[PDB]
């Protein structure tokens, strides 16, 4: 996270760290959506051009964390993967369309003050919240700069941007399964996600029922916190029918 701030304790209790077993390192962000299911970006698990293709046994998820590198005894919970599910129409060849994947844990995770699921939006909460100008919140243990690493979870709030402005900031083909967020240069404030934040959540707190909803997944960007560029996010609601399908089935 570039130009954000330290998170408060328990601020993002749905935050998950995707951790590689050997070599032990941070893969990506992810989110807790129930006691056995974690949501992340497909690209965190599968990106053949870079010969990335993780299987279940390559990874751990760490839940309940704040410090990036510490083992947080009596606080974090570490879970093993039963099965990975990637969107079958995930477009890794072109633009990361449908950049979404689910991970089912081998055993349910115990909720706690530090461990708690986020909500997924329904149609109305997305129509109501996913508006240009409305701010969401991004969290992660990713890089502090485009070109070090934080000691604790970082947080930043960013406004959703107008689709034509998103489209005009990049040569990449944008789809309806994506949105972009970030400040414009004339706005002065700032912030962005960055390497290592990939797969983490973009959340909004509904002013109607005071619950946090995950509207986005950190998907891609061109650099980090560059003027005139914006972070891109997987549109969770848009892909909700696939999420529903997997969980109902499995």
């Amino acid at each position: 996270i570039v130009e954000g701030s330290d998170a408060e304790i328990g601020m993002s209790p749905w935050q998950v760290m995707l951790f590689r077993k050997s070599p032990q390192e941070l893969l990506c962000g992810a989110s807790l959506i129930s006691d056995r299911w974690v949501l992340t970006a497909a690209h965190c698990l599968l990106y053949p051009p870079w010969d990335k293709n993780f299987t279940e046994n390559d990874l751990l998820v760490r839940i309940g964390k704040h410090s990036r590198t510490r083992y947080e005894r009596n606080i974090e919970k570490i879970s093993m993967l039963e099965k990975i599910y990637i969107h079958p129409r995930y477009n890794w060849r072109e633009n990361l369309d449908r950049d979404i994947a689910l991970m089912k844990l081998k055993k349910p995770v115990a909720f706690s003050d530090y461990i708690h699921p986020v909500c997924l939006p329904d149609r109305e909460t997305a129509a109501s919240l996913l508006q240009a100008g409305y701010k969401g919140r991004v969290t992660g243990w990713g890089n502090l700069k485009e070109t070090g690493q934080p000691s604790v979870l970082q947080v930043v709030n960013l406004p959703i941007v107008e689709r034509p402005v998103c489209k005009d900031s990049t040569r990449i083909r944008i789809t309806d399964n994506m949105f972009c967020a970030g400040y414009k240069p004339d706005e002065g404030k700032r912030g962005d996600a960055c390497e290592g934040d990939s797969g983490g959540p973009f959340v909004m707190k509904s002013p109607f029922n005071n619950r946090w909803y995950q509207m986005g997944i950190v998907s891609w960007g061109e650099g980090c916190d560059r003027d005139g560029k914006y972070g891109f996010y997987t549109h969770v609601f848009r892909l909700k029918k696939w999420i529903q399908k997997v969980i109902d089935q499995f």
Partner: peptide, 10 residues
């Protein structure tokens, strides 16, 4: 660099 995690989780 990461703190080692308990053996159990591998």
């Amino acid at each position: 660099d990461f703190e080692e995690i308990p053996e159990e989780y591998l």
